[PDB]
Structure formats: structure tokens, C-alpha cells
Structure 1
Amino acid sequence: TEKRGRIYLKAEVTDEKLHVTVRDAKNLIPMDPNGLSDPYVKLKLIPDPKNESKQKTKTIRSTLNPQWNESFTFKLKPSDKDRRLSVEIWDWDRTTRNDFMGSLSFGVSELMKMPASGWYKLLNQEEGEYYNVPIPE
């Protein structure tokens, strides 16, 4: 909800597993010639040097206010204490590289001391890997 729009999420750590719900997003930035985008969300635990934690929602065509309503589960291990949940919205493009739309992240430990829930401001790509900005109201 500021330049790159906002996203509604839920994420809690229930003994063993991290549960994430990606509800919807609003006011996303136009990344297509038609003035829209084809948004999908990529969920990842970072760092992910082996590149194995990737999960993704379906792609919704031609919209800036997608409603995915999809949930995901990551098995956690003691090694994940220092990892973060990365949430990135991307714009599916058929004839070129997919465009970045907005992102954010949560510390696994952070989520364990308080599950995330509600609206969050979409951040730039690099910075999105470092923090999140909740939007109460």
C-alpha cells in the first residue's frame, strides 16, 4: 500500500511446520504494455543455496488486484533458526523475463514469537529480503 501496493498474508509456526496463507493483493504496479500484470507469489526460505524451498501460487492473468487464496507449508529444522520467509510477487511474462512487482520477508524466529497476519506494504526487491512493514488500518 505505497508505490508497490499491499498484500494480505498469514504466517504461523506451529511446532515443526511453517504455515503461510497468501490471500490477496491490491494496487500492484503495472508491468505490462496493457497497463496490467500477471501476478504470482513466490515463497522461499532464505538463504536457499541449494534452491529447494521454492513454492509458488497460481498465476492470475491481467489484474492488479489478484486474489489467490492459497496456503503453503514448509517443514522446519533447527537449522532454519537463522532463515527468513521470503515472499515475492512477480509478473509472469511470456516473451521476456518476468518482472518483479514487490516483496517482503519475515524471520523464522520472528514468526515463532508472533505469527504474521494482516496487510503488509510491498517493498523493493533487495530490501524485501531484509524486513517487512505491517499496515494496521
Structure 2
Amino acid sequence: TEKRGRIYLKAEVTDEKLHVTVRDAKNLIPMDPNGLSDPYVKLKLIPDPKNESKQKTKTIRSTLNPQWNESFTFKLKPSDKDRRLSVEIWDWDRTTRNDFMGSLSFGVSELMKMPASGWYKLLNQEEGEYYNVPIPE
């Protein structure tokens, strides 16, 4: 439906490189029967027809408030001017398919103008690939 928690990130473009820091997320919704989840974050630059830009944080077991503190770097190219940084939280599972938890995205153009920083509301999978919602509140 709609409330999936929030995540704190930092993203910036410097000298043809995109730097992203995934700090932590709060109030995630349990996808595991146990009432918790095993979250990890997938980062990519889309569209990614060749599927070459994927990066992911480690999976943190049994928590609804993960603190990854991981940084990533993407080497950019001109065409990236029209791409977006997609950030998705998934719930790792031992025996079933991993479940989508929440996501968002930023335009590489957006970031070149203004770096991202702070808390953001997690969105549903489809919509997450098109926009982001800061939470300065």
C-alpha cells in the first residue's frame, strides 16, 4: 500500500563519478514470518539494458532498522545525463524469493545540480523508479 519506512542516503556527482552513501533505514515492514526482515540495498543506474551497474550493500539479518554505513561509486559517461540512480531495499530470505521492501530514485541530472542528503520516504517498486520524497520534516 504505502508506508514502508525511510532511508538516509547521500549522493553526489564529482568529476564524472557518482558517489553514494547508504547509511541506515528506519521503520521497515517485516517480510519474514518472524516479524522482522533481512535487508540489503540494491543500487543501479537505469535504464541498464546490459545489466552492468548493479551494486549492493551487505545483508543485515533480523532487523527492521538496518545500519549499513556503506559507500559506493559509479563511473559515469555522457549518456548518463538521462539516467537515474535507483535505490531499492529488498528482504533476503533463506528459502523463498527475496521480497521488495521499498525504493526511490534520483535523476543523475538532479544530483549534478544538487547533491542528495538526508532522510527519504520509501516508495513502492514501480513508482520508486520515477521519483523521490525527501523528509526534512
Shift of residue 61, structure 1, vs aligned partner: 0.0
1:2 and 1:21 map into 2 onto residues whose CA distance is 25
CA deviations over 1:51-96 (Å, ceiling 9, x no partner): 0100000000000000000000000000101000000000001111
2:18 and 2:3 map into 1 onto residues whose CA distance is 29
Q: Give runs of aligned pairs for residues 41-80 of structure 1, distance below 5 A.
A: 41-80=41-80
Match of 2:20, SS state, is strand
1:9 and 1:67 map into 2 onto residues whose CA distance is 11
Instruction: Give ranges in structure 1 of 5+ residues lacking alignment.
Output: none
> Which residue of structure 1 aligns with residue 37 of structure 2?
37
Query: What TM-score comes out, normalization by structure 2 length?
Result: 0.98
Give the aligned CA root-mean-square deviation in angstroms.
Answer: 1.3
1:117 and 1:80 map into 2 onto residues whose CA distance is 20
Shift of residue 108, structure 1, vs aligned partner: 0.3
2:76 and 2:50 map into 1 onto residues whose CA distance is 16
1:126 and 1:132 map into 2 onto residues whose CA distance is 12
Contact 1:2/1:121 (CA < 8 Å) preserved in 2? no
Shift of residue 2, structure 1, vs aligned partner: 6.5
Match of 1:118, SS state, is strand
What percent identity do the matched residue pairs reach? 100
2:75 and 2:14 map into 1 onto residues whose CA distance is 10
2:104 and 2:29 map into 1 onto residues whose CA distance is 15
Contact 2:19/2:74 (CA < 8 Å) preserved in 1? yes
Shift of residue 113, structure 1, vs aligned partner: 0.4
Match of 2:43, SS state, is strand
Contact 2:2/2:124 (CA < 8 Å) preserved in 1? no
Instruction: Give ranges in structure 2 of 5+ residues lacking alignment.
Output: none
2:104 and 2:118 map into 1 onto residues whose CA distance is 13
Which is further off, 1-10 or 112-121?
A: 1-10
1:19 and 1:128 map into 2 onto residues whose CA distance is 20
Contact 2:102/2:125 (CA < 8 Å) preserved in 1? yes
2:47 and 2:131 map into 1 onto residues whose CA distance is 14
The count of corresponding residues between Structure 1 and Structure 2 is 137
1:128 and 1:37 map into 2 onto residues whose CA distance is 20
